[model samples]
Target: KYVDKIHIGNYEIDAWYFSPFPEDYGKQPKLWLCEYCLKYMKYEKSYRFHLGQCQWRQPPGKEIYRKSNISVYEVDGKDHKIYCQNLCLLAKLFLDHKTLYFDVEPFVFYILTEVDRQGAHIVGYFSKEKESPDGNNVACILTLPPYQRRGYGKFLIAFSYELSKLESTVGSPEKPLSDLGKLSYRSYWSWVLLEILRDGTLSIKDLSQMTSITQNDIISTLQSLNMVKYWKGQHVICVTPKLVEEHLKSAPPITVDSVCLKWAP
Candidate 1:
Protein backbone atom coordinates (compact mmCIF):
# COMPACT_ATOMS: atom_id res chain seq x y z
CA LYS A 1 0.00 0.00 0.00
CA TYR A 2 3.06 2.28 0.43
CA VAL A 3 6.20 2.79 -1.67
CA ASP A 4 9.25 1.60 0.22
CA LYS A 5 11.82 0.81 -2.40
CA ILE A 6 12.74 2.20 -5.81
CA HIS A 7 14.76 0.26 -8.35
CA ILE A 8 18.05 2.01 -9.09
CA GLY A 9 19.82 0.07 -11.78
CA ASN A 10 20.63 -3.22 -9.96
CA TYR A 11 20.02 -1.89 -6.44
CA GLU A 12 16.67 -1.62 -4.71
CA ILE A 13 16.90 1.74 -2.94
CA ASP A 14 15.47 1.92 0.57
CA ALA A 15 13.09 4.86 0.32
CA TRP A 16 11.52 4.27 3.77
CA TYR A 17 8.23 6.00 2.92
CA PHE A 18 5.33 5.59 0.56
CA SER A 19 3.71 7.86 -1.97
CA PRO A 20 2.29 7.63 -5.46
CA PHE A 21 5.13 8.60 -7.78
CA PRO A 22 3.48 8.45 -11.18
CA GLU A 23 0.11 7.17 -12.32
CA ASP A 24 1.73 4.84 -14.83
CA TYR A 25 3.81 3.20 -12.09
CA GLY A 26 0.74 2.76 -9.86
CA LYS A 27 -0.03 -0.77 -11.01
CA GLN A 28 3.59 -1.70 -11.56
CA PRO A 29 5.46 -3.50 -8.81
CA LYS A 30 8.54 -1.26 -8.95
CA LEU A 31 9.79 2.09 -10.09
CA TRP A 32 12.87 1.67 -12.26
CA LEU A 33 14.74 4.82 -11.22
CA CYS A 34 17.66 5.92 -13.35
CA GLU A 35 20.77 6.62 -11.25
CA TYR A 36 22.51 8.99 -13.63
CA CYS A 37 19.52 11.20 -14.44
CA LEU A 38 16.81 10.29 -11.88
CA LYS A 39 14.27 9.28 -14.51
CA TYR A 40 11.87 6.56 -13.45
CA MET A 41 10.44 3.95 -15.79
CA LYS A 42 7.54 1.60 -15.37
CA TYR A 43 8.96 -1.22 -17.45
CA GLU A 44 12.23 -2.96 -16.58
CA LYS A 45 13.10 -3.40 -20.23
CA SER A 46 12.55 0.32 -20.88
CA TYR A 47 14.47 1.22 -17.74
CA ARG A 48 17.47 -0.87 -18.70
CA PHE A 49 17.41 0.44 -22.25
CA HIS A 50 17.19 4.03 -21.11
CA LEU A 51 20.02 3.56 -18.63
CA GLY A 52 22.18 2.23 -21.45
CA GLN A 53 21.42 5.40 -23.45
CA CYS A 54 21.31 8.10 -20.75
CA GLN A 55 24.65 9.94 -20.70
CA TRP A 56 24.30 12.63 -18.09
CA ARG A 57 27.14 12.20 -15.61
CA GLN A 58 25.72 14.93 -13.42
CA PRO A 59 22.86 17.37 -13.43
CA PRO A 60 23.03 19.67 -16.48
CA GLY A 61 23.79 22.61 -14.20
CA LYS A 62 26.94 24.52 -13.31
CA GLU A 63 28.90 23.05 -10.45
CA ILE A 64 28.99 25.57 -7.62
CA TYR A 65 30.13 23.66 -4.56
CA ARG A 66 32.10 20.43 -4.27
CA LYS A 67 34.16 19.02 -1.43
CA SER A 68 35.08 15.57 -0.19
CA ASN A 69 32.86 13.62 -2.59
CA ILE A 70 29.94 16.04 -2.22
CA SER A 71 28.65 18.57 -4.73
CA VAL A 72 26.00 21.23 -5.20
CA TYR A 73 24.87 22.50 -8.59
CA GLU A 74 22.90 25.55 -9.59
CA VAL A 75 20.24 24.86 -12.20
CA ASP A 76 18.08 27.47 -13.81
CA GLY A 77 14.57 26.13 -14.34
CA LYS A 78 14.15 28.32 -17.39
CA ASP A 79 17.18 26.68 -18.94
CA HIS A 80 16.78 23.09 -17.72
CA LYS A 81 13.05 22.66 -17.86
CA ILE A 82 13.07 18.92 -18.42
CA TYR A 83 15.42 18.16 -15.55
CA CYS A 84 13.75 20.61 -13.15
CA GLN A 85 10.27 19.28 -13.97
CA ASN A 86 11.42 15.74 -13.33
CA LEU A 87 12.98 16.89 -10.07
CA CYS A 88 9.81 18.73 -9.07
CA LEU A 89 7.61 15.71 -9.67
CA LEU A 90 10.02 13.42 -7.86
CA ALA A 91 9.97 15.74 -4.86
CA LYS A 92 6.18 15.35 -4.68
CA LEU A 93 6.73 11.73 -3.70
CA PHE A 94 8.42 12.98 -0.53
CA LEU A 95 7.16 16.56 -0.13
CA ASP A 96 3.67 17.99 0.15
CA HIS A 97 2.08 21.06 -1.49
CA LYS A 98 4.77 22.02 -4.02
CA THR A 99 4.11 23.34 -7.49
CA LEU A 100 3.84 21.19 -10.56
CA TYR A 101 5.02 24.09 -12.62
CA PHE A 102 3.55 24.56 -16.08
CA ASP A 103 6.47 26.94 -16.61
CA VAL A 104 9.26 26.49 -14.10
CA GLU A 105 10.71 29.86 -14.83
CA PRO A 106 11.33 32.49 -12.11
CA PHE A 107 13.03 30.01 -9.80
CA VAL A 108 16.41 28.36 -9.37
CA PHE A 109 17.11 24.76 -8.38
CA TYR A 110 20.05 23.76 -6.20
CA ILE A 111 20.88 20.12 -6.81
CA LEU A 112 22.77 18.60 -3.87
CA THR A 113 24.91 15.61 -4.73
CA GLU A 114 27.20 12.71 -3.95
CA VAL A 115 30.19 12.93 -6.22
CA ASP A 116 32.80 10.83 -8.17
CA ARG A 117 31.51 7.20 -8.49
CA GLN A 118 28.37 9.12 -7.60
CA GLY A 119 28.66 10.81 -10.96
CA ALA A 120 27.08 13.55 -8.83
CA HIS A 121 24.02 11.49 -7.90
CA ILE A 122 21.29 13.75 -6.59
CA VAL A 123 20.80 13.33 -2.84
CA GLY A 124 18.60 16.31 -2.07
CA TYR A 125 17.73 19.73 -3.45
CA PHE A 126 16.20 23.09 -2.58
CA SER A 127 14.71 25.77 -4.82
CA LYS A 128 14.42 29.50 -4.33
CA GLU A 129 12.76 32.32 -6.19
CA LYS A 130 15.31 33.97 -8.44
CA GLU A 131 14.00 37.14 -6.89
CA SER A 132 11.91 37.00 -3.73
CA PRO A 133 9.65 39.70 -2.42
CA ASP A 134 9.14 38.15 1.01
CA GLY A 135 12.77 37.35 1.86
CA ASN A 136 12.03 33.64 1.45
CA ASN A 137 15.36 31.96 0.83
CA VAL A 138 13.90 28.55 0.12
CA ALA A 139 10.78 27.84 -1.90
CA CYS A 140 10.80 24.07 -1.67
CA ILE A 141 13.13 21.39 -0.42
CA LEU A 142 13.57 17.63 -0.97
CA THR A 143 15.82 14.92 0.25
CA LEU A 144 15.72 12.03 -2.23
CA PRO A 145 14.11 8.91 -0.85
CA PRO A 146 17.26 6.83 -1.01
CA TYR A 147 19.27 9.46 0.85
CA GLN A 148 16.83 10.72 3.45
CA ARG A 149 19.17 9.59 6.21
CA ARG A 150 18.09 12.76 8.12
CA GLY A 151 21.19 14.91 7.63
CA TYR A 152 20.37 15.81 4.03
CA GLY A 153 17.35 17.86 5.05
CA LYS A 154 19.34 20.06 7.43
CA PHE A 155 22.25 20.13 5.01
CA LEU A 156 20.05 21.56 2.27
CA ILE A 157 18.58 24.13 4.65
CA ALA A 158 22.08 25.16 5.73
CA PHE A 159 23.05 25.44 2.08
CA SER A 160 20.18 27.85 1.46
CA TYR A 161 21.33 30.01 4.37
CA GLU A 162 24.86 29.93 3.01
CA LEU A 163 23.56 31.51 -0.18
CA SER A 164 21.87 34.22 1.83
CA LYS A 165 25.10 34.80 3.73
CA LEU A 166 26.91 35.31 0.47
CA GLU A 167 24.28 37.63 -0.94
CA SER A 168 24.52 39.90 2.12
CA THR A 169 20.94 39.15 3.00
CA VAL A 170 19.07 36.98 5.50
CA GLY A 171 15.84 35.05 5.06
CA SER A 172 13.50 32.45 6.36
CA PRO A 173 12.08 29.52 4.40
CA GLU A 174 8.75 30.07 2.68
CA LYS A 175 5.71 29.44 4.84
CA PRO A 176 3.55 27.84 5.95
CA LEU A 177 6.03 25.31 7.20
CA SER A 178 4.71 21.78 7.46
CA ASP A 179 4.79 19.79 10.71
CA LEU A 180 7.96 18.17 9.39
CA GLY A 181 9.40 21.59 8.64
CA LYS A 182 8.72 22.89 12.13
CA LEU A 183 10.94 20.21 13.64
CA SER A 184 13.73 20.62 11.13
CA TYR A 185 13.89 24.41 11.22
CA ARG A 186 13.70 24.56 14.98
CA SER A 187 16.69 22.30 15.40
CA TYR A 188 18.62 24.18 12.76
CA TRP A 189 17.78 27.49 14.37
CA SER A 190 18.90 26.13 17.72
CA TRP A 191 22.33 25.17 16.47
CA VAL A 192 22.85 28.35 14.49
CA LEU A 193 21.86 30.67 17.30
CA LEU A 194 23.67 28.74 19.97
CA GLU A 195 26.82 28.56 17.89
CA ILE A 196 26.85 32.34 17.68
CA LEU A 197 25.97 32.80 21.32
CA ARG A 198 28.83 30.54 22.26
CA ASP A 199 31.37 32.98 20.97
CA GLY A 200 29.90 36.33 21.99
CA THR A 201 26.84 38.34 22.81
CA LEU A 202 24.58 39.79 20.12
CA SER A 203 21.14 41.33 20.00
CA ILE A 204 18.38 39.68 17.95
CA LYS A 205 18.77 42.54 15.52
CA ASP A 206 22.42 41.69 15.08
CA LEU A 207 21.59 38.00 14.85
CA SER A 208 19.04 38.59 12.11
CA GLN A 209 21.38 40.74 10.06
CA MET A 210 24.30 38.40 10.54
CA THR A 211 22.64 35.02 10.02
CA SER A 212 20.08 36.10 7.45
CA ILE A 213 17.37 34.41 9.47
CA THR A 214 14.26 36.33 10.44
CA GLN A 215 14.07 38.04 13.84
CA ASN A 216 10.76 36.44 14.73
CA ASP A 217 12.08 32.98 14.00
CA ILE A 218 15.15 33.70 16.03
CA ILE A 219 13.00 34.70 18.97
CA SER A 220 10.64 31.79 18.49
CA THR A 221 13.42 29.25 18.39
CA LEU A 222 15.19 30.78 21.38
CA GLN A 223 11.96 30.70 23.32
CA SER A 224 11.28 27.15 22.23
CA LEU A 225 14.71 26.20 23.52
CA ASN A 226 13.84 27.93 26.81
CA MET A 227 16.77 30.26 26.34
CA VAL A 228 14.85 33.51 26.43
CA LYS A 229 13.99 35.28 29.69
CA TYR A 230 11.64 38.23 29.79
CA TRP A 231 12.55 39.79 33.13
CA LYS A 232 12.52 43.45 32.24
CA GLY A 233 10.87 45.54 29.56
CA GLN A 234 13.06 43.58 27.14
CA HIS A 235 14.21 39.97 26.87
CA VAL A 236 17.53 38.43 27.82
CA ILE A 237 19.03 35.61 25.77
CA CYS A 238 20.82 32.95 27.75
CA VAL A 239 22.72 29.96 26.41
CA THR A 240 26.06 28.76 27.64
CA PRO A 241 28.97 27.52 25.52
CA LYS A 242 28.64 24.22 27.33
CA LEU A 243 25.02 24.02 26.29
CA VAL A 244 25.88 25.10 22.75
CA GLU A 245 28.46 22.35 22.31
CA GLU A 246 26.07 19.78 23.69
CA HIS A 247 23.27 20.86 21.34
CA LEU A 248 25.58 21.11 18.35
CA LYS A 249 26.73 17.55 18.86
CA SER A 250 23.13 16.37 18.62
CA ALA A 251 22.99 17.27 14.92
CA PRO A 252 24.50 15.40 12.00
CA PRO A 253 28.20 16.09 11.51
CA ILE A 254 27.97 17.17 7.86
CA THR A 255 27.64 20.84 6.99
CA VAL A 256 28.46 23.39 4.28
CA ASP A 257 32.21 23.84 3.68
CA SER A 258 32.30 27.32 2.24
CA VAL A 259 36.02 27.13 1.46
CA CYS A 260 35.26 24.59 -1.28
CA LEU A 261 32.45 26.66 -2.78
CA LYS A 262 33.15 28.54 -6.03
CA TRP A 263 30.03 30.54 -6.71
CA ALA A 264 29.74 34.35 -6.67
CA PRO A 265 26.68 36.35 -5.77
Candidate 2:
Protein backbone atom coordinates (compact mmCIF):
# COMPACT_ATOMS: atom_id res chain seq x y z
CA LYS A 1 0.00 0.00 0.00
CA TYR A 2 1.23 3.57 -0.75
CA VAL A 3 0.23 7.21 -0.29
CA ASP A 4 0.33 9.34 -3.45
CA LYS A 5 0.03 12.99 -2.43
CA ILE A 6 1.94 15.56 -0.32
CA HIS A 7 1.24 19.26 0.32
CA ILE A 8 3.89 21.97 -0.04
CA GLY A 9 3.94 25.72 -0.69
CA ASN A 10 0.26 25.86 -1.68
CA TYR A 11 0.76 23.06 -4.21
CA GLU A 12 -0.06 19.39 -3.92
CA ILE A 13 2.74 17.09 -5.11
CA ASP A 14 2.04 13.75 -6.81
CA ALA A 15 4.27 10.81 -5.90
CA TRP A 16 4.43 7.03 -5.25
CA TYR A 17 5.41 5.59 -1.86
CA PHE A 18 6.34 2.09 -0.65
CA SER A 19 6.64 0.03 2.53
CA PRO A 20 9.76 -1.98 1.52
CA PHE A 21 9.15 -4.77 4.00
CA PRO A 22 6.25 -6.67 5.54
CA GLU A 23 5.05 -7.04 9.17
CA ASP A 24 7.58 -6.36 11.99
CA TYR A 25 10.07 -4.78 9.54
CA GLY A 26 12.25 -3.68 12.46
CA LYS A 27 13.31 -7.22 13.20
CA GLN A 28 17.09 -7.85 12.98
CA PRO A 29 17.59 -5.32 10.13
CA LYS A 30 16.48 -6.47 6.71
CA LEU A 31 18.58 -6.01 3.56
CA TRP A 32 16.15 -4.41 1.15
CA LEU A 33 16.87 -5.25 -2.51
CA CYS A 34 15.29 -4.58 -5.89
CA GLU A 35 13.78 -7.40 -7.89
CA TYR A 36 14.57 -5.92 -11.29
CA CYS A 37 18.07 -4.45 -10.77
CA LEU A 38 19.32 -6.61 -7.86
CA LYS A 39 21.84 -3.89 -6.90
CA TYR A 40 21.23 -1.38 -4.11
CA MET A 41 21.53 2.33 -4.58
CA LYS A 42 21.02 5.05 -1.96
CA TYR A 43 17.59 6.06 -0.74
CA GLU A 44 17.56 8.96 -3.19
CA LYS A 45 16.12 9.02 -6.75
CA SER A 46 18.10 6.27 -8.42
CA TYR A 47 17.18 3.38 -6.16
CA ARG A 48 13.80 4.88 -5.30
CA PHE A 49 12.35 4.27 -8.74
CA HIS A 50 12.76 0.54 -8.31
CA LEU A 51 11.53 0.61 -4.72
CA GLY A 52 8.23 2.10 -5.80
CA GLN A 53 7.62 0.12 -8.98
CA CYS A 54 9.35 -3.17 -8.30
CA GLN A 55 8.37 -5.86 -5.83
CA TRP A 56 11.79 -6.75 -4.38
CA ARG A 57 13.77 -3.90 -2.75
CA GLN A 58 17.37 -4.34 -1.63
CA PRO A 59 18.82 -2.49 1.35
CA PRO A 60 20.86 0.43 -0.09
CA GLY A 61 24.26 0.24 1.71
CA LYS A 62 26.33 -2.88 1.18
CA GLU A 63 29.76 -4.28 0.25
CA ILE A 64 29.56 -2.23 -2.93
CA TYR A 65 28.85 1.45 -2.09
CA ARG A 66 28.61 1.54 1.73
CA LYS A 67 25.47 3.64 2.00
CA SER A 68 23.67 4.96 5.07
CA ASN A 69 20.33 6.34 6.28
CA ILE A 70 18.12 8.67 4.25
CA SER A 71 16.25 11.45 6.04
CA VAL A 72 14.32 13.77 3.75
CA TYR A 73 13.52 17.06 5.46
CA GLU A 74 10.28 18.93 4.97
CA VAL A 75 10.98 22.71 4.73
CA ASP A 76 8.32 24.15 7.00
CA GLY A 77 9.62 25.88 10.12
CA LYS A 78 6.17 25.36 11.51
CA ASP A 79 7.04 21.70 11.52
CA HIS A 80 9.69 21.04 14.31
CA LYS A 81 8.67 17.58 13.44
CA ILE A 82 11.07 18.29 10.55
CA TYR A 83 13.94 20.34 12.06
CA CYS A 84 17.77 20.71 11.82
CA GLN A 85 17.93 19.36 8.31
CA ASN A 86 20.83 21.71 7.65
CA LEU A 87 23.59 19.96 9.59
CA CYS A 88 23.36 16.52 8.06
CA LEU A 89 22.51 17.66 4.57
CA LEU A 90 25.45 20.05 4.67
CA ALA A 91 27.79 17.12 5.25
CA LYS A 92 26.20 14.94 2.60
CA LEU A 93 25.84 17.56 -0.12
CA PHE A 94 29.21 19.27 0.30
CA LEU A 95 31.61 16.73 1.81
CA ASP A 96 30.31 13.76 -0.17
CA HIS A 97 30.29 15.68 -3.43
CA LYS A 98 33.90 16.75 -2.76
CA THR A 99 34.87 13.18 -3.59
CA LEU A 100 33.73 13.86 -7.14
CA TYR A 101 35.70 17.11 -7.61
CA PHE A 102 39.07 18.60 -6.69
CA ASP A 103 38.13 22.03 -5.37
CA VAL A 104 35.86 22.90 -2.41
CA GLU A 105 33.29 25.69 -2.25
CA PRO A 106 30.37 26.86 -0.14
CA PHE A 107 27.80 25.65 -2.64
CA VAL A 108 24.80 23.39 -1.82
CA PHE A 109 22.35 24.50 0.83
CA TYR A 110 20.55 21.44 2.22
CA ILE A 111 17.00 20.46 3.12
CA LEU A 112 17.15 17.44 5.40
CA THR A 113 15.84 15.77 8.57
CA GLU A 114 17.23 13.55 11.35
CA VAL A 115 18.39 10.09 10.35
CA ASP A 116 17.92 6.49 11.61
CA ARG A 117 15.63 7.44 14.46
CA GLN A 118 12.05 6.26 14.81
CA GLY A 119 9.72 8.09 12.42
CA ALA A 120 12.96 9.05 10.65
CA HIS A 121 11.17 10.35 7.64
CA ILE A 122 13.13 12.70 5.42
CA VAL A 123 10.15 13.71 3.33
CA GLY A 124 12.24 15.54 0.69
CA TYR A 125 15.23 17.85 0.18
CA PHE A 126 17.16 19.85 -2.46
CA SER A 127 20.44 21.78 -2.93
CA LYS A 128 22.29 23.99 -5.42
CA GLU A 129 25.94 24.76 -6.19
CA LYS A 130 27.36 27.89 -7.83
CA GLU A 131 28.10 27.34 -11.50
CA SER A 132 29.86 30.62 -12.20
CA PRO A 133 31.69 33.44 -10.47
CA ASP A 134 28.54 35.47 -11.08
CA GLY A 135 26.17 32.99 -9.42
CA ASN A 136 24.86 30.69 -12.14
CA ASN A 137 23.73 27.48 -10.37
CA VAL A 138 23.23 23.72 -10.59
CA ALA A 139 20.82 21.72 -8.45
CA CYS A 140 20.30 18.27 -6.94
CA ILE A 141 17.10 17.00 -5.33
CA LEU A 142 15.83 13.97 -3.42
CA THR A 143 12.77 12.66 -1.62
CA LEU A 144 12.68 10.04 1.11
CA PRO A 145 11.19 6.59 0.58
CA PRO A 146 7.74 7.19 2.02
CA TYR A 147 7.39 10.83 0.89
CA GLN A 148 8.24 10.51 -2.81
CA ARG A 149 4.79 10.97 -4.35
CA ARG A 150 3.72 14.17 -2.55
CA GLY A 151 5.46 16.78 -4.73
CA TYR A 152 7.85 17.69 -1.91
CA GLY A 153 10.86 17.69 -4.26
CA LYS A 154 9.59 20.74 -6.16
CA PHE A 155 9.12 22.80 -3.02
CA LEU A 156 12.60 21.90 -1.82
CA ILE A 157 14.19 22.97 -5.11
CA ALA A 158 12.43 26.32 -5.05
CA PHE A 159 13.64 27.00 -1.53
CA SER A 160 17.15 25.86 -2.39
CA TYR A 161 17.43 28.49 -5.17
CA GLU A 162 16.42 31.27 -2.82
CA LEU A 163 19.16 30.21 -0.41
CA SER A 164 21.81 29.93 -3.12
CA LYS A 165 21.59 33.60 -4.05
CA LEU A 166 22.32 34.79 -0.53
CA GLU A 167 25.64 32.90 -0.55
CA SER A 168 26.75 33.96 -4.04
CA THR A 169 27.95 37.43 -3.05
CA VAL A 170 31.29 35.99 -1.94
CA GLY A 171 32.31 35.74 -5.60
CA SER A 172 33.78 39.20 -6.27
CA PRO A 173 34.57 42.52 -4.70
CA GLU A 174 31.85 45.10 -5.32
CA LYS A 175 33.94 48.30 -5.29
CA PRO A 176 37.51 49.63 -5.17
CA LEU A 177 39.29 50.95 -2.04
CA SER A 178 41.33 54.16 -1.62
CA ASP A 179 43.64 55.54 1.08
CA LEU A 180 42.35 58.35 3.27
CA GLY A 181 43.83 58.91 6.74
CA LYS A 182 41.39 58.36 9.79
CA LEU A 183 38.95 55.43 9.24
CA SER A 184 39.88 55.83 5.61
CA TYR A 185 43.50 55.37 6.72
CA ARG A 186 42.87 51.71 7.40
CA SER A 187 40.99 51.13 4.17
CA TYR A 188 43.47 53.21 2.20
CA TRP A 189 46.39 51.22 3.56
CA SER A 190 44.46 47.97 3.01
CA TRP A 191 44.44 48.58 -0.73
CA VAL A 192 48.18 49.27 -0.95
CA LEU A 193 48.98 46.51 -3.41
CA LEU A 194 45.80 47.07 -5.35
CA GLU A 195 46.20 50.86 -5.14
CA ILE A 196 49.72 50.76 -6.43
CA LEU A 197 48.59 49.00 -9.54
CA ARG A 198 45.47 51.13 -10.05
CA ASP A 199 47.52 54.20 -8.95
CA GLY A 200 46.39 54.81 -5.30
CA THR A 201 43.05 56.41 -6.08
CA LEU A 202 40.21 54.45 -4.37
CA SER A 203 38.97 55.08 -0.77
CA ILE A 204 38.53 52.79 2.27
CA LYS A 205 34.73 53.01 2.17
CA ASP A 206 34.71 52.05 -1.49
CA LEU A 207 37.13 49.17 -1.02
CA SER A 208 35.40 47.91 2.14
CA GLN A 209 32.03 47.84 0.38
CA MET A 210 33.61 46.26 -2.69
CA THR A 211 35.43 43.48 -0.87
CA SER A 212 32.61 42.80 1.61
CA ILE A 213 35.15 42.67 4.42
CA THR A 214 35.57 45.19 7.22
CA GLN A 215 37.75 48.22 6.47
CA ASN A 216 39.47 47.53 9.79
CA ASP A 217 40.51 44.00 8.83
CA ILE A 218 41.75 45.15 5.45
CA ILE A 219 43.76 47.88 7.12
CA SER A 220 45.40 45.43 9.48
CA THR A 221 46.28 43.07 6.64
CA LEU A 222 47.94 45.90 4.77
CA GLN A 223 50.06 46.85 7.78
CA SER A 224 51.07 43.22 8.06
CA LEU A 225 51.82 43.05 4.34
CA ASN A 226 54.13 46.05 4.64
CA MET A 227 55.90 44.47 7.60
CA VAL A 228 56.54 41.32 5.56
CA LYS A 229 57.91 43.26 2.56
CA TYR A 230 54.99 42.17 0.35
CA TRP A 231 54.67 45.91 0.22
CA LYS A 232 57.72 48.02 -0.84
CA GLY A 233 57.79 50.55 2.09
CA GLN A 234 55.76 52.75 4.46
CA HIS A 235 55.41 55.77 2.16
CA VAL A 236 54.27 53.70 -0.85
CA ILE A 237 51.73 51.34 0.85
CA CYS A 238 49.37 50.67 -2.05
CA VAL A 239 51.93 49.34 -4.52
CA THR A 240 49.86 50.40 -7.55
CA PRO A 241 52.27 49.87 -10.44
CA LYS A 242 53.36 46.39 -9.39
CA LEU A 243 49.76 45.37 -8.69
CA VAL A 244 48.70 46.72 -12.08
CA GLU A 245 51.38 44.74 -13.84
CA GLU A 246 50.47 41.57 -11.96
CA HIS A 247 46.76 42.20 -12.52
CA LEU A 248 47.35 42.55 -16.24
CA LYS A 249 49.19 39.24 -16.24
CA SER A 250 46.60 37.29 -14.21
CA ALA A 251 43.57 39.47 -14.98
CA PRO A 252 40.86 37.56 -13.06
CA PRO A 253 43.10 36.23 -10.28
CA ILE A 254 43.89 32.58 -9.67
CA THR A 255 42.11 30.11 -7.38
CA VAL A 256 41.95 26.36 -7.00
CA ASP A 257 39.99 24.67 -9.78
CA SER A 258 36.51 23.64 -8.71
CA VAL A 259 35.56 20.01 -8.28
CA CYS A 260 32.25 20.32 -10.06
CA LEU A 261 33.50 18.11 -12.86
CA LYS A 262 36.58 15.96 -13.47
CA TRP A 263 39.10 18.79 -13.12
CA ALA A 264 42.85 18.54 -13.74
CA PRO A 265 44.55 16.09 -11.40
Q: Write candidate 2's Cα lDDT for 1-265 as tens digits.
A: 3223322212343433232222342231222323222332333354456555654222121211111343332222222211223222222322222221112243333444334433232344443443555333333345454444343443333233323333433222112211111233233233433544354455545554454444444556555544222335332235446545554455111111122111110
Candidate 1 Cα RMSD (Å): 3.0
Cα deviation at 228, candidate 2, in Å, is: 9.9
Error of 2 at 68 (Å): 35
lDDT of 2 at 102: 18
lDDT by residue (tens digit), candidate 1, 150-185: 688888888899899899888889877766677778
Candidate RMSDs in Å, in order, are: 3.0, 18.4
Model 1's lDDT to the true fold? 0.78
lDDT of each: 0.78, 0.34
- Model 1, 77: alpha-carbon shift in Å? 0.3
